[PDB]
RNA sequence: AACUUCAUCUACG
């Protein structure tokens, strides 16, 4: 159920959109959850 | 004197002009009821307020 | 804001008596003597004139929205 | 097993007041006559208001409230007028209502006091007890009040605007002899106006066999109905309520049989 | 519709998608003016 | 057949 190596993060789980809903305002804009912004930062750094 | 029956109330009652204030808290603003209404997006539970 | 028609407690008309009350106060009459002259007997009716604050005069100072 | 025969003696009768005494009557009957004075005597008062233009400082429903509280002469035709619910015609008509109109504008610089005198009735018998005047609103220059009102028959149980009386003074046992009120210190208590005691005696001696009788009334009219006719109409209305009750009771007894 | 001016109290008619400025005074606060339909008030 | 969130403050028993 838990091997010590699995504690080190080699694959980051990205939660479903239900966990991080997109906050819609007037249809003019769609703010994104804090998790979405943090995941964007993680993806940017990973690509770099 | 008792308003309903007209008989004198046995205990004499303290009456006088006192200044009273109507506070902003009114029942019509506070009465509320909920039955399968709107529901939040994240928790999918009934809303607040 | 304006003198209520009818005393709350009993219902005697006190709305017609505010201007006469003010006139009698201008004459020399004390508040109690003016209230007696107007015919107000119960302290419920005397409370209506005695405690009344006439704000309609202050509100009439502002210019009307449509002239 | 039968009703007692009451007696009335009128002490004072003025255009604003009736002071009378009812003897050989029950406390319940006396109190309910007083109660009918207050709540079950029909009168005429404004209950429908339509404000065409209100530029006064007071909002529309404030003006409507004040107009409703204004008394209206209801001496004779209140018995003739029908209730709006009873009247066959839709909304209101001359038989079920009386129309009033107010068209006041303050063209002059000086503040215009809109009074009950400015209310004009379509029927002469109902007038706003003008024959000072009740002040409806004060109008600054350039402010105008225009409205149409309908006055309907009703009694004070519906709304206090339909109260025909100001203060009903009801007293029994002026000197405490039935001990219906037990004074902790009898001497401190002021004597009643109807009291027959000497100044030394604070209370009359306890009457074990006594019953409340000889009730004293002072009925003050609001001006809509004469103080005499308030009392007469109250007695007649209570009698009519009892007769209606008896009719329904007889019908239901027949149904049970 | 017709909007009464806030300051000079003169009715001016402003079309839709037009700047809210009263002619002859320039005040930028207008008021919609009372409705023609009439509401019944019970005096109660 | 139908209107987001945060945050703050202010009140309520
Ligand atoms: C009697 O106890 C009650 C309850 O415990 C509940 N309550 C109230 N405030 C709070 C709060 O901040 N937090 C929590 N957890 N509970 C709270 O309110 C308490 C009393 O408060 P009070 O002492 O003002 O009641 P008066 O004696 O004043 O009553 P008056 O004569 O005005 O009607
Ligand atoms: Zn009074
Ligand atoms: Zn009719
Ligand atoms: Zn202008």
Provide, as residue numbers in chain D, all residues whose Cβ is less than 8 Å from the Cβ of C2: 58, 66, 135, 137-138
A23 touches strand F (CB under 7 A): yes
| Reported resolution, Å | 2.8
Q: Would you kindly state where each structural domain of chain C is located, as residue ranges? A: 1-67
How many distinct structural domains can be found in chain D?
2
In angstroms, how far is CA C22 from the centroid of its own chain? 8
Both structure tokens of B33: 């009821």
A32 touches strand F (CB under 7 A): no
Q: How much of chain D is in helix, strand and coil states, percent to nearest 5?
A: 25, 30, 45
Contact D149, D67 (CB under 8 A): yes
**D160, D194, D221 - which closes a domain:** D160
**What is the spatial distance between Cα D249 and Cα D112, in angstroms, rounded to a whole number?**
57
Both structure tokens of E19: 């700047």
Crossing angle of the two packed helices D227-256 and D27-39, in degrees rounded to 10: 110
Contact B12, D183 (CB under 8 A): yes
Q: Which fold has domain E1-44?
A: Rubrerythrin, domain 2 (2.20.28)
Question: What was the elucidation method?
Answer: cryo-EM
Supply angle C-alpha D178, D184, D185, rounded to 5. Answer: 100
Q: Which nucleotides on strand F sit less than 7 A from a protein beta carbon?
A: 2-6, 12
**C7 annotated ligand binder:** yes
Largest CA distance in chain D: 77
Both structure tokens of D222: 């609001």
Count the residues in chain A: 48
CB contact under 8 Å between B9 and D181, yes or no, is: yes
Domain with D34 in it: what CATH number? 3.30.1360.10
Show the domain range for D257.
Answer: 1-42+161-257
Provide, as residue numbers in chain C, all residues whose Cβ is less than 8 Å from the Cβ of B17: 43-44, 47
The CATH classification number of C1-67 equals 1.10.10.60
Question: Is residue D182 located within the same domain as residue D211?
Answer: yes
Question: Is residue D156 located within the same domain as residue D51?
Answer: yes
Nearest Cα residue to D153 out of D85, D241, D245, D58: D85
**What is the spatial distance between Cα D38 and Cα D170, in angstroms, rounded to a whole number?**
12
**D160, D176, D196 - which closes a domain:** D160
Largest CA distance in chain B: 65
The Å distance, CA of B29 to C1' of F13, is 16
**Chains that contact B by 3+ CB pairs under 8 Å?**
A, C, D
Closest nucleotide to B30's CA, by C1' atom? Answer: F12
Contact D192, D252 (CB under 8 A): no
The Å distance, CA of B38 to C1' of F2, is 9
Question: Is residue D53 located within the same domain as residue D152?
Answer: yes
Question: Is residue D27 located within the same domain as residue D131?
Answer: no
């Amino acid at each position: 159920y838990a091997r010590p190596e699995w504690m080190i993060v080699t694959v980051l789980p990205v939660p479903p959109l239900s966990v991080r809903p997109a906050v819609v305002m007037q249809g003019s804009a769609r703010n994104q959850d804090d998790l979405t912004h943090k995941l964007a930062d993680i993806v940017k750094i990973n690509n770099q | 004197y008792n308003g309903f029956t007209g008989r004198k109330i046995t205990s004499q009652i303290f009456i006088g002009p006192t200044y009273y204030q109507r506070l902003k808290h009114m029942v019509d603003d506070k009465i509320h009821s909920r039955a399968r209404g709107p529901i939040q997006i994240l928790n999918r539970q009934p809303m607040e307020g | 804001m304006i003198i209520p028609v009818r005393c709350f407690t009993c219902g005697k008309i006190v709305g017609n008596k505010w201007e006469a009350y003010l006139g009698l106060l201008q004459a020399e009459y004390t508040e109690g003597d003016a209230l007696d002259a107007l015919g107000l007997k119960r302290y419920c009716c005397r409370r209506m004139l005695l405690a009344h604050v006439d704000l309609i005069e202050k509100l009439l100072n502002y210019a009307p929205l449509e002239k | 097993p039968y009703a007692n025969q009451p007696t009335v003696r009128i002490t004072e009768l003025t255009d604003e007041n009736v002071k009378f005494i009812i003897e050989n009557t029950d406390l319940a009957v006396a109190n309910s006559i007083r109660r009918v004075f207050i709540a079950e005597v029909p009168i005429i008062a404004i209950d429908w208001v339509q404000i065409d233009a209100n530029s006064s400082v007071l909002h529309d429903e404030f003006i409507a409230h004040r107009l409703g509280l204004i008394p209206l002469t209801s001496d004779d035709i209140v018995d003739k007028l029908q209730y709006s619910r009873d009247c066959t015609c839709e909304e209101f008509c001359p038989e079920c209502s009386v129309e009033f109109t107010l068209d006041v504008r303050c063209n002059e610089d000086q503040t215009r006091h809109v009074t009950s005198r400015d209310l004009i009735s379509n029927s002469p018998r109902v007038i706003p007890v003008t024959s000072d005047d009740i002040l409806i609103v004060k109008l600054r220059k350039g402010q105008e009040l225009r409205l149409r009102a309908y006055a309907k028959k009703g009694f004070g149980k519906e709304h206090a605007k339909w109260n025909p009386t100001a203060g009903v003074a009801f007293e029994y046992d002026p000197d405490n002899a039935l001990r219906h009120t037990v004074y902790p210190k009898p001497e401190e208590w002021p004597k009643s106006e109807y009291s027959e005691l000497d100044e030394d005696e604070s209370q009359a001696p306890y009457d074990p066999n006594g019953k409340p009788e000889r009730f004293y009334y002072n009925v003050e009219s609001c001006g809509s109905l004469r103080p005499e006719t308030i009392v007469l109409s109250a007695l007649s209305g209570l009698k009519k309520k009892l007769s209606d009750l008896q009719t329904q009771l007889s019908h239901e007894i027949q149904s049970d049989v | 519709m017709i909007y009464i001016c806030g300051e000079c109290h003169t009715e001016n008619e402003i079309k839709s998608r037009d700047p809210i400025r009263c002619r002859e005074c320039g005040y930028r606060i207008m008021y919609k003016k009372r409705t023609k339909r009439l509401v019944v008030f019970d005096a109660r």
